[PDB]
């Protein structure tokens, strides 16, 4: 139906690829199978190789490199791609190890990226950027500061864009009066070769007087709208400079992304809950 094509200025080498975002099922990565369509006269003696790179940047810390000898030779999609091209189209087949850092970067490049580089040479080009990504497969906190603060989330896993509900229960039996309540979202993006990030803050002047009970659900939603000017914000994989989401929550070497909800009473008693923020398998 569809297939991504990329070739060199000479066009002697062409790479045909089925997908460009391979879902990490956590037990099997969609194999990187493509097709190299060469002209015999431009390679003659020199061989044709294809390389799968998993470069980590910030410094080119190539966490993985694998070369597949397209020619001489060493899937149904590959079959159909070849039948339209003949002999001088040769398949390649890379397998991403499950234990790799998913495609993630930072909003200013920096981060992680996969790559398919196809080159013809006698001994060990088309630069096809792919990505490894994951799909979406009850938090409760209580702190007795007395100043009893309890916070719960309806569910742990929320899709991007989907709003998060925060059930708050403050039983203020002490002499101190709550001045504000802040339900904030913290995005921790650890670069492993951990920094906090506030992305959403529904600060409300809700004051709970002594020996009182306060209880209502807040609705907070982390969006790229107001995060555009946050250096080091973890964004998902950018194919050729598209506009991307918030780095999904890694499910465990590269960059680890975690998301938590913090409930703070500005009097300070606080609690925190983790939530998962990956897109749903369409």
């Amino acid at each position: 139906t569809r297939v991504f094509k990329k070739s060199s200025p000479n066009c002697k080498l062409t790479v045909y690829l089925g997908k460009r975002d391979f879902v990490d099922h956590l037990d099997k990565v969609d194999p990187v199978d493509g097709v190299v369509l060469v002209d015999p006269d431009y390679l003659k003696d020199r061989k044709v190789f294809v390389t799968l790179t998993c470069a980590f940047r910030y410094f080119r810390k190539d966490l993985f490199i694998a070369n597949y000898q397209a020619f001489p030779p060493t899937t149904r999609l590959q079959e159909r791609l070849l039948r339209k091209l003949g002999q001088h189209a040769h398949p390649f087949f890379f397998t991403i190890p499950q234990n790799l850092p998913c495609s993630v970067t930072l909003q200013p490049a920096c981060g992680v990226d996969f790559e398919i580089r196809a080159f013809c040479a006698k001994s060990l080009s088309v630069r096809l950027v792919i990505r490894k990504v994951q799909f979406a497969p009850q938090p409760s906190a209580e702190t007795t500061r007395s100043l009893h603060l309890e916070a719960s989330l309806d569910k742990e896993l929320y899709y991007h864009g989907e709003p998060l509900n925060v059930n708050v229960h403050v039983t203020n039996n002490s002499t101190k009066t709550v001045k504000k309540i802040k339900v904030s979202v913290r995005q921790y993006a650890d670069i492993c070769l951990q920094y906090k990030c506030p992305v959403a803050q529904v600060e409300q002047d809700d004051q709970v007087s002594p020996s009182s009970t306060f209880c209502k659900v807040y609705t907070i939603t982390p969006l790229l709208s107001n995060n555009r000017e946050k250096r080091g914000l973890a964004l998902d994989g950018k194919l050729k400079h598209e506009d991307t989401n918030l780095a999904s929550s890694t499910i465990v070497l590269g960059i680890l992304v975690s998301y938590r909800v913090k409930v703070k009473l500005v009097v300070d008693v606080s609690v925190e809950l983790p939530f998962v923020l990956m897109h749903p398998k369409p």
């Binding site: 094509k5 990329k6 045909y16 791609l81 050729k240």
Partner: peptide
């Protein structure tokens, strides 16, 4: 850059 043919 990346083209896009059919199959």
């Amino acid at each position: 850059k990346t083209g896009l043919t059919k199959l």
